[PDB]
Symmetry: D2
Subunit: 268 residues, 4 copies
């Protein structure tokens, strides 16, 4: 489609000093809210399929729902598997044509995280798919050495580290050091619990992908409640879930602007 | 898939004295609620794509969302275009592989209703797709003569007439007369405003397709409100929209049982 | 894909004084020969699926084989159903996403040709698909009056008439008169039995689609024989059928140049 | 589709004392010849996409051509990647939905053959895809020890060894020893240069997949020559390539019967 590899998309954002919003989708309205936001803002975007939606809707059905809503979309879109803890699941996402995957081995030993992430990375790189991995430790902030050893052992395109969020004060100095030593884009997890000003500075220092989930569901739910609070007998899902969608679309737009990706679709 | 022609499905229900529920879907959760209901009840089912959802989600995207959720479904499923007033729209549904279409020309003159419905019917019949049409009048209840003239001029497989509902007391005698003279299955519109006992008798007299929309959206919305009434800070769409889905699934099950299609999937 | 409506493609050729070659395909190598020819020449092209290949390979399988070979093709391509004599078959081609269809009712009465062609034309026009029809008579050359009456009654986009070929001296004056009175592009059938100079003049006078079948199969067969004449123990289909493909590709290139469509892909 | 995993298909043949023919396809007619042969014989079958056809037609286009001809096929079919020497190519076959792959590392050191084959095997096994590997040596016949070490290090489902053919007298004793020690199905390569009686005995001793390529192309070419020898002006590809197809279909039938898979589709 106008689907683009996550490797290409993130590296471009990192090179040009902005980030890609990685927006978690959970159903039809939420997928559409993200895509319409991106199209209006002329922004590249990632749509994340994470573990919660996979347990509810299925991985391959969500992929197919995204495909269904791409009919009128011309901006760069990358479908990303979020926080996989299974080599098998990661392979399923690769097989149904995702453009980016994350194997999160941060719960494993350093050696095993590296070994499985690396094995997934070799498959992704064979098929032009972006690869994300994550490390915590090998005091609670990842060291340059740990980040470099992880990056080199796995060949991930982009990496998440322990930088001061939780799944909050960002370790800006550390992030700066990581850009110079590791020389790869950084992914922020748990960024919704951090102020906007801090987000902007993290991106200036090398964060090129920012995960957004709860904040979108909060905006969606707030739209729903507002309609149904006013009128509990409003039975048109077009109106109730529709307003949720509009309020979530506005949130996505707000994030796109924060991240600096508005207007960047021309660059691809 | 286990997709089946609407002509086959409705004629079978009519022959065997039960009806097919034609359940209007509006998004991912609502499609899934219908399919899971049908699978659990071992019931043939129609999923309707009507004018409201087409204005919100699009016709072809809804078709593709239904396809996405068929992965584990083995019961007979027929996707039906509801209340089209456009020859063009009806042709679009045929092109993307619907198994039943309705052209509603009941707002047109008798001659023009017949002419357009007939033209759509010739396309549907060329491709093994079920065809529905509707007549009101040519006192507020359709005459046998009108129903026969419409049926013969259009060659519809199943037809809706003015039988005592509104889009309420059913014209049972008239329906009986229509079975003997017209000798085709009847479709009920506006049946949610009619008691269960009346529905059961209409089916005994030849109603073989019963449209259900508002009652499902009411059940969905009631699930949503219940979760969000309890806890407005419940931001998991899996929980809020999920409970809506479960409450809607139960409604579909209730309708399947009313219509008598539970257990009938073996018959196909 | 870079699939384009036949209505668009033919009208453009007619407006600009060139024709589209409508090249009949019969299998994998022959489809590819046409597409590679068109890509090299930067030419719009029609690929025809006609009655012979439908009896051998099937209509929907040929469509899917064309789709398989479009992966690296960027020039305008239109898949056309050739010489259908069945409303049902024409509807099947529409359903699987052809971009042009021909219903040939020239074996029927004038009134019935018009009635069926018109019915197919209404479906095609509903879905942005090009429509071709054919008339002979209502002395062996079609009159302006007959062509105009047929064109007006059917609303075909392009039409074949009896102009001096057989399925040979072209009726150039008649063709000129037809351009001024009917004001639609003309399709030539049986053009392989006519010299190049005559083809060029027919195109100058309004022929905008030229059917090519036998000449391609002759070129293919000549490639095959040449390899197998030299070496009957050449068992590599890559070599034998491959050389057939190369010799057929050259023939297609030759036709593209005759028709004047080389270089015209920029115009779309 | 009625596509079945190669792991399932080969293990079943091995368990029941017959083999699966793995028939190399090169284009539309040759795919169809194999499928029609299998359907008529009520036989499970593998269709191989090997290195020659990949260089001519492409890997993904051949997959899509096979899919196009499955419309009326109900017997078990497995699409297999033959003699890949590239991890990347093997991953491409996995991604487009092959049901069996072979990584041939027999040109590499033992350690590197094992390492790459194993890595491909982990991906295949994650997605329920059959895995083949090959070993020669670590005098020209593979030892039990070598076969066991290779089998254990890679976890292939089925394996090719050096058993007395060339890419000829079969090493029956060795094959017997391999069944008892390795306890996996064996794949024969280069079996066309071996008599039928020898093939039957190899299958009795554990050969459960027999590759067939040249013999089919020889049968196809012989059909072609026969038509074109008689009549060089026979330009109907339906007749010339058609007769090739019929003569190749008969060859496939002959192989199915040799291998003992005729009638075995019921067993699945
Ligand atoms: Zn995270
Ligand atoms: Zn994380
Ligand atoms: Zn209605
Ligand atoms: Zn109605
Ligand atoms: Zn012709
Ligand atoms: Zn003709
Ligand atoms: Zn081999
Ligand atoms: Zn080999």
């Amino acid at each position: 489609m106008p689907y683009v590899s996550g490797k290409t998309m993130i590296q471009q954002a990192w090179k040009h000093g902005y980030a890609i919003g990685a927006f978690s989708a959970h159903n039809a309205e939420t997928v559409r809210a993200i895509l319409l936001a991106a199209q209006e803002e002329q922004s590249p975007v990632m749509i994340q399929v994470g573990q919660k939606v996979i347990s509810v809707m299925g991985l391959k059905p969500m992929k197919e729902i995204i495909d269904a809503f791409m009919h009128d979309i011309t901006v760069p879109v990358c479908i990303h598997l979020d926080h996989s803890r299974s080599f098998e699941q990661t392979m399923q996402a690769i097989q149904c044509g995702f453009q980016s995957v994350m194997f999160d081995g941060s719960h494993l030993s350093f050696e095993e995280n590296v070994r499985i992430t690396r094995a997934a990375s070799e498959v992704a790189h064979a098929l032009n798919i972006g690869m994300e991995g994550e490390i915590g430790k090998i005091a609670l902030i990842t060291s340059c050495d740990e980040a470099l050893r992880f990056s080199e052992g796995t060949d991930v395109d982009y990496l998440a580290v322990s930088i001061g969020t939780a799944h909050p004060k960002l370790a800006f100095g550390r992030l700066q050091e990581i850009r110079e030593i590791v020389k790869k884009p950084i992914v922020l997890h748990g960024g919704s619990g951090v102020p906007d000003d801090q987000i902007r500075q993290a991106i200036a220092l090398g964060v090129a992908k920012v995960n957004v989930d709860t904040e979108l569901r909060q905006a969606f739910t707030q739209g729903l409640c507002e309609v149904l609070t006013n009128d509990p007998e409003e039975y048109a899902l077009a109106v109730s879930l529709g307003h949720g969608r509009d309020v979530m679309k506005e949130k996505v737009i707000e994030k796109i602007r924060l991240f600096g990706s508005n207007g960047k679709a021309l660059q691809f």
